[PDB]
Amino acid sequence: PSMGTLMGVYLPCLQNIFGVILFLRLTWMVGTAGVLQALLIVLICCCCTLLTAISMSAIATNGVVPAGGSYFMISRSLGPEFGGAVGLCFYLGTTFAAAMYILGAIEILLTYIAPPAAIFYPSGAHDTSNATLNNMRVYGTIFLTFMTLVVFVGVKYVNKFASLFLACVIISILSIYAGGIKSIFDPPVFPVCMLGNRTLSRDQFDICAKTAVVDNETVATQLWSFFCHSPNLTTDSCDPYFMLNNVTEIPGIPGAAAGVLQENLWSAYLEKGDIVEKHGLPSADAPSLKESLPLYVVADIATSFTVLVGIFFPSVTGIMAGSNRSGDLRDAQKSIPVGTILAIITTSLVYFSSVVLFGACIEGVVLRDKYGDGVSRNLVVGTLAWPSPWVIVIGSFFSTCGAGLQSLTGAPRLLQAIAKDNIIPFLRVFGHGKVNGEPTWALLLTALIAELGILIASLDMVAPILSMFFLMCYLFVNLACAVQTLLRTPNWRPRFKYYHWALSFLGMSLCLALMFVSSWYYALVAMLIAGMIYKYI
Amino acid sequence: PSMGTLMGVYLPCLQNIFGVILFLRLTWMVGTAGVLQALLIVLICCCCTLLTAISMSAIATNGVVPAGGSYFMISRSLGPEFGGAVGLCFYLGTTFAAAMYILGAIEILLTYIAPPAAIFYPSGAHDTSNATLNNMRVYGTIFLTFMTLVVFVGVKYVNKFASLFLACVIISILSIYAGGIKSIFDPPVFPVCMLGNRTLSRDQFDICAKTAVVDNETVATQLWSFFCHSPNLTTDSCDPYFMLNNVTEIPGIPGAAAGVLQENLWSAYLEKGDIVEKHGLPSADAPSLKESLPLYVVADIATSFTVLVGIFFPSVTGIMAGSNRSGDLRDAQKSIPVGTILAIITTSLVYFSSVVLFGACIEGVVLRDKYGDGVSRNLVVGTLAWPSPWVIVIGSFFSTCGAGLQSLTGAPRLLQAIAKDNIIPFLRVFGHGKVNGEPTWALLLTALIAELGILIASLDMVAPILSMFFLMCYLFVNLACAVQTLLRTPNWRPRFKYYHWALSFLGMSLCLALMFVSSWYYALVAMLIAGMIYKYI
Ligand SMILES: C[C@@H]1CC[C@@]2(OC1)O[C@H]1C[C@H]3[C@@H]4CC=C5C[C@@H](OCCC(CO[C@@H]6O[C@H](CO)[C@@H](O[C@H]7O[C@H](CO)[C@@H](O)[C@H](O)[C@H]7O)[C@H](O)[C@H]6O)CO[C@@H]6O[C@H](CO)[C@@H](O[C@H]7O[C@H](CO)[C@@H](O)[C@H](O)[C@H]7O)[C@H](O)[C@H]6O)CC[C@]5(C)[C@H]4CC[C@]3(C)[C@H]1[C@@H]2C
Ligand SMILES: C[C@@H]1CC[C@@]2(OC1)O[C@H]1C[C@H]3[C@@H]4CC=C5C[C@@H](OCCC(CO[C@@H]6O[C@H](CO)[C@@H](O[C@H]7O[C@H](CO)[C@@H](O)[C@H](O)[C@H]7O)[C@H](O)[C@H]6O)CO[C@@H]6O[C@H](CO)[C@@H](O[C@H]7O[C@H](CO)[C@@H](O)[C@H](O)[C@H]7O)[C@H](O)[C@H]6O)CC[C@]5(C)[C@H]4CC[C@]3(C)[C@H]1[C@@H]2C
Ligand SMILES: *[C@@H]1O[C@H](CO)[C@@H](O[C@@H]2O[C@H](CO)[C@@H](O)[C@H](O)[C@H]2NC(C)=O)[C@H](O)[C@H]1NC(C)=O
Ligand SMILES: *[C@@H]1O[C@H](CO)[C@@H](O[C@@H]2O[C@H](CO)[C@@H](O)[C@H](O)[C@H]2NC(C)=O)[C@H](O)[C@H]1NC(C)=O
Ligand SMILES: *[C@@H]1O[C@H](CO)[C@@H](O[C@@H]2O[C@H](CO)[C@@H](O)[C@H](O)[C@H]2NC(C)=O)[C@H](O)[C@H]1NC(C)=O
Ligand SMILES: *[C@@H]1O[C@H](CO)[C@@H](O[C@@H]2O[C@H](CO)[C@@H](O)[C@H](O)[C@H]2NC(C)=O)[C@H](O)[C@H]1NC(C)=O
Ligand SMILES: [Cl-]
Ligand SMILES: [Cl-]
């Protein structure tokens, strides 16, 4: 065993924590919640994990720290009852995170890389979502049946290229910071066309003007034809909101200033179907026709605080997958507690700095465009890249693919280790594998359980389920670290400096309050199931 | 044991089959799906149950038919493995049917009996649904905590008044048929105010006219003020759909004729947010303003075939709850197979005749008004009653309450009988009860499981889950009746005339195809769970 702290503990944690939601759902979160409540969300979601890392350090400073994975540590240091629960919940969390990463990759591919690589098209006027759900499901089944056979053939090639996917993440982060620094002096040019407070999708028209001049003649634009249903300048079928207000271009990225960070400081939540609006523009009040409603930027899902906590939270998970190399380390009780806490601190500072950066540079209306409908169907993050937006797009695609492949390689190892331990004979048949030690049947089971995550067909709907399972895993870790101190069992002696039982109780209570925040109904169900099993034994 | 077929078997089945969906969700189903596809739905949903009744008759013509409930028949005649599965699924079906009946009673009370007995009000312009969901949850918790303590005190009083709730059902049916017969000669008067194809909610304005004459002077009506935002007759802020089309009153119930049954013969499905339209009216095309969209009849939920099958199906369940008196009968192997099949035939003929009746008499636009927003917030069914619409309203309220009370008295008996049998020790603590034999802890468990059904807070969302659980119960009944014939076990000799194994296989396949129709995702989950338990043993 010859492994240091850096390439043994810190780098697997920092490859597992970073991922998809920093590139897809962060600018939306900032522009919806405000910089203040965004920092509140990041501060809350990083204190469940820090106290869980303290409890895992108390796991790590006891006994022998047995070799292989992170399962056997809990299984030998806390009894089988907590160990099976933590292993099963971490298994379910990894298998649904695979489905989340696949859906992220397909969202990036369909809306940004290849727009005409779409099978289903939005027939009719409304319902551009059901076609999108059917369009996500097909490519999800294709990529899942591809990337399970790739794992079924090429484990050694996946472990060989395990560093390139982390390299793509770090290059893509540094590009964001370089463009954000340069945006103080010379901003890029991404113009936003608006009409009063209402912003409108630039993808369907050519030029942002009410009337243009061609051939020494004032002719109505194509934008006149989309709102007035006639190319004549003296008609009265125009809705009075197009008539009483004017069309204005603003800079989408105005550069880093105090005024921009002042404007995007407070929360502007929206209901499903509302139109994204500024606050400081003249806008005369008039009613709008219904047939011009797809000529705007419409908020997709309902936004609140408890939605955004549940969407943000799996950006911070990935602690337990830094102890998979626990046998290979030289001093296992030293590299684990230092390494995981350093990784969590670095990633949390990255999120704080990125929230402040996106709030300071990019204007909030471009921030409130999920899918980037306000700027030319581009990434809102990618407009802040310095060399080109394609750096973030390509690095995000390969990072999501690498994370999905690493989840699909990791989870059957855990189910293999649970099945071979004979803790539960109901899973006994999943102890069968190849002659190399690689699993055979458990790959099929994770391929089928991750399929049900794919068929929900949205990033924003799979993410609260991941929040639920990882919060159950961390809560049982904190219960097992607190009860063993409070009940005074022998062979439980934590040789850690900063450990005390009130920190584990605060971790338990905070990760339970987050569980009731993120989605209260299934937490209310899981309370009933766990209370029923408590009434049995 | 002195019980005949009529008051022993036929009357409990006919009290359990009839219920809430004949009074709330039948006219909506006819007006959405057409008479043809409605008869197709009724014909499909009654052939799962008829073949299941043939299989239960093959249960009934074997052995001794042991005393007490319907659980012990399957448990002693088919082994414990199928018996525990059928008992547990029928338990879950009864406990969620309690929540469905409570939500039906609260819907009838809030929208028809007492409109100002509402805590939450629709604040803002849109989102009249979230206030309604919060308004259903509160009264659901109140009525559930009332009607569990009523069962906890008054079992003898509930069993005493068990016939009055059936009497209310039959009086309410005969009132419908009397008004439907009289509607040939003299129809009632329920006028429907429309504007082109679009119909509009009469509840917010007074008179259906564009301009009225008061004091020898043409003055714009209040209906002019709701569409034009000004009481002046020469303004131009009116949307062109109000300007180019005219306001017309039609009879809502035009009387039974060939032309009415001709018009409502084909399916008119609608998407969420569309406006209910006729087919044979002049209507000039023009765009409509957005601020007049609550002045119409808007379809609440998305409508298709697989939605309507899942909503309709628990109107036919209630077979197994006709064998609860199996010990009390004189000849148990005679009254059960004749009685249950006669009950199913009578209720199915009631549904066929009622579908043809509602299609023939009531006009389809009033049929397509879920909650009755087109006619004065009245029941669409109740406008067809002869003496008064209040007969149907009061009988429907007391029938839903009686059905909920009977479900809450029935389900803990079944969990008691499962727990005392020691088939599953994990439920062993639910064998404790009173000194009378009445259960104590299992009442709390059915009160908490039915609570999670209440918190979904819609009739149309709880009903597919009931469809799922009762289809799983009937499918395991057909599997257990087919495998025992095909595997040639002794002590399985059905002394029934019309029994053959292909009927049980057709029942299995049809109740499985209905399971994939009603909601495919949770059926796809249940397939995985059952296939995993199959791979264990
Ligand atoms: C130990 C051993 C290992 C293996 C095993 O056990 C043994 O492990 C267990 C673990 C099991 C799994 C545990 C949890 C599960 C999650 C569960 O999902 C619950 C709800 C969610 C799924 O929603 C469903 O999604 C499907 C597909 O869309 C819907 O079906 C629809 O499909 C079509 C569409 O074309 C159409 O017919 C209908 O739409 C419908 O049929 C279902 O209806 C739907 O319920 C999460 O979805 C929730 O949906 C809400 C929408 O109302 C959404 O609310 C918000 O929605 C939008 C946001 O997008 C906003 O407008 C608003 O803010 C809100 O309205 C919620 O956000 C969202 O949470 C499914 C089962 C599963 C996976 C368990 C499977 C078994 C399991 C693996 C076992 C094994 C055996
Ligand atoms: C043997 C022993 C006995 C006891 C026990 O085991 C041991 O028995 C088992 C059995 C277990 C139960 C098994 C099944 C269960 C059903 C499961 O529900 C699945 C989905 C449904 C619930 O939907 C959820 O509803 C809640 C509440 O609304 C939502 O939460 C929301 O709440 C607020 C609103 O204010 C807000 O925050 C968000 O909206 C959200 O948080 C959940 O999100 C939601 O998932 C059915 O709902 C489905 O929802 C679809 C909407 O997308 C709908 O699709 C259609 O929707 C409308 C129609 O209304 C149309 O526009 C379209 O046509 C479609 O979009 C679907 O129709 C609908 O199906 C919950 C668990 C439960 C009860 C199990 C509990 C445990 C259990 C009893 C065990 C015990 C231990
Ligand atoms: C939209 O912008 C135009 C500018 O082209 C505004 O027009 C006004 O025009 C008159 C004479 O042309 C000027 O005296 C006013 O100062 C202009 N008002 C401004 C610049 O606010 C028009 O009023 C604008 N519409 C709005 C703000 O609703
Ligand atoms: C954008 O402008 C409108 C007026 O042109 C602002 O006013 C609101 O408009 C809505 C229409 O849906 C009304 O319901 C509100 O009563 C109006 N509020 C007022 C007049 O205070 C609207 O607030 C602006 N949007 C912003 C500032 O985000
Ligand atoms: C709505 O109804 C009115 C009837 O009051 C229609 O008015 C037309 O009126 C002229 C002269 O008053 C008649 O010669 C026409 O025969 C009427 N047309 C009819 C009765 O169809 C008006 O056209 C109607 N609007 C529609 C159908 O869009
Ligand atoms: C009611 O009348 C309208 C016209 O006044 C009919 O025409 C359709 O209107 C919709 C508007 O949403 C258009 O998208 C369609 O293209 C129109 N169809 C045509 C002109 O054939 C509408 O069909 C009528 N509703 C019915 C018959 O149910
Ligand atoms: Cl983790
Ligand atoms: Cl039944």
Residue B198 three-state SS: strand
From which experimental method does this structure derive? cryo-EM
**Shared-domain flag, residues B321 and B468:** yes
B535 Cβ contact partners less than 8 Å away, ≥ 6 residues apart: A429
B525 occurs within a structural domain: yes
**Shared-domain flag, residues A482 and A424:** yes
Residue B287 three-state SS: coil
CB-CB contact of A292 with A226 (8 Å): yes
Distance, in Å, from the CA atom of A377 to the CA atom of A369, rounded to the nearest integer, reads 10
Using a CB–CB cut-off of 8 Å, the residues of B that contact A are 126-127, 229, 236-237, 239-240, 271, 273, 287-291, 293, 426, 429, 448, 452, 455, 521, 524-525, 528, 535-536
Q: Which domain holds residue B232?
A: 191-252+270-292
Distance, in Å, from the CA atom of A139 to the CA atom of B296, rounded to the nearest integer, reads 40
**Shared-domain flag, residues A294 and A308:** no
Closest by CA position to A229, among listed A239, A241, A217? A239
CB-CB contact of B314 with B470 (8 Å): yes
DSSP letter at A363 equals -
- Whether ligand 4 lies within 6 angstroms of the CB of A283 is answered as yes
Name residue B45's amino acid. Answer: C
Give Rg (Cα) of chain B.
Answer: 26
Distance, in Å, from the CA atom of B344 to the CA atom of B18, rounded to the nearest integer, reads 11
B60 occurs within a structural domain: yes
* CATH assignment at residue B343: 1.20.1740.10
Measured between CA atoms, the residue of chain B closest to residue A527 is B448
A372 occurs within a structural domain: yes
Contact B289 A289 (CB under 8 A): yes
| DSSP, residue by residue, A300-358 | -S---HHHHHHHHGGGT--SGGGSTTTTT-SSHHHHHHHHHHHHHHHHHHHHHHHHHHH
Name residue A8's amino acid. Answer: G
Residues of A with CB below 8 A from B289's CB? Answer: 239, 287-290
CB-CB contact of A93 with A307 (8 Å): no
**Shared-domain flag, residues B66 and B169:** yes
Kindly provide the b/e burial profile for residues A244-265, where b requires at least 16 CB atoms within 10 angstroms of the residue's own CB.
ebebeeeebbebbeeebeebbe
**Shared-domain flag, residues A146 and A60:** yes
Residues of B with CB below 8 A from A535's CB? Answer: 429
A262 occurs within a structural domain: no
**Contacts A–B by Cβ distance under 8 A:** 53
**Shared-domain flag, residues B201 and B135:** no
- Whether ligand 1 lies within 6 angstroms of the CB of A142 is answered as no
Distance, in Å, from the CA atom of A52 to the CA atom of A301, rounded to the nearest integer, reads 32
**Shared-domain flag, residues B451 and B329:** yes
Distance, in Å, from the CA atom of B316 to the CA atom of B313, rounded to the nearest integer, reads 6
List, in sequence order, the alpha helices (H) in B313-389: 332-361, 364-367
Contact B455 A536 (CB under 8 A): no
A1 occurs within a structural domain: no
Closest by CA position to A118, among listed A296, A128, A459, A101? A128
Q: Which of B88, B92, B290 to probe the A interface (max A CBs under 10 A)?
A: B290
B521 occurs within a structural domain: yes
CB-CB contact of B229 with B237 (8 Å): yes
**Shared-domain flag, residues A377 and A452:** yes
Distance, in Å, from the CA atom of B384 to the CA atom of B361, rounded to the nearest integer, reads 8
Nearest CA residue ID for atom 9, ligand 4: A285
Distance, in Å, from the CA atom of B494 to the CA atom of B78, rounded to the nearest integer, reads 12
HEC string of A69-92 equals CCHHHHHHHCCHHHHHHHHHHHHH
A315 occurs within a structural domain: yes
**Shared-domain flag, residues A152 and A122:** yes
Closest by CA position to A484, among listed A83, A120, A117, A77? A77
How many domains does chain A divide into? 2
Distance, in Å, from the CA atom of A462 to the CA atom of B217, rounded to the nearest integer, reads 63
DSSP letter at B110 equals I
B162's tokens: 């068990």
Give helix B80-108 / helix B130-153 axis angle, nearest 10°: 120
Out of B260, B292, B324, a domain closes at: B292
**Shared-domain flag, residues B18 and B104:** yes
Distance, in Å, from the CA atom of A465 to the CA atom of B194, rounded to the nearest integer, reads 46
Residues of B with CB below 8 A from A273's CB? Answer: 126
**Shared-domain flag, residues A170 and A210:** no
B260 occurs within a structural domain: no
Q: Is B317 annotated as a binding residue?
A: yes
Contact B535 A239 (CB under 8 A): no
Contact B448 A535 (CB under 8 A): no
| DSSP, residue by residue, B385-450 | -SS-THHHHHHHHHHHHHHHHHHHHHHHHHHHHHHHTTS-GGGGGGG-B-SSS-BSHHHHHHHHHH
Q: A95 vs A406, A408, A422, B356, B523, CA distance in Å? A: 11, 7, 22, 51, 20
Give helix A459-486 / helix A27-60 axis angle, nearest 10°: 30
A110's tokens: 């369909």
**Shared-domain flag, residues A27 and A86:** yes
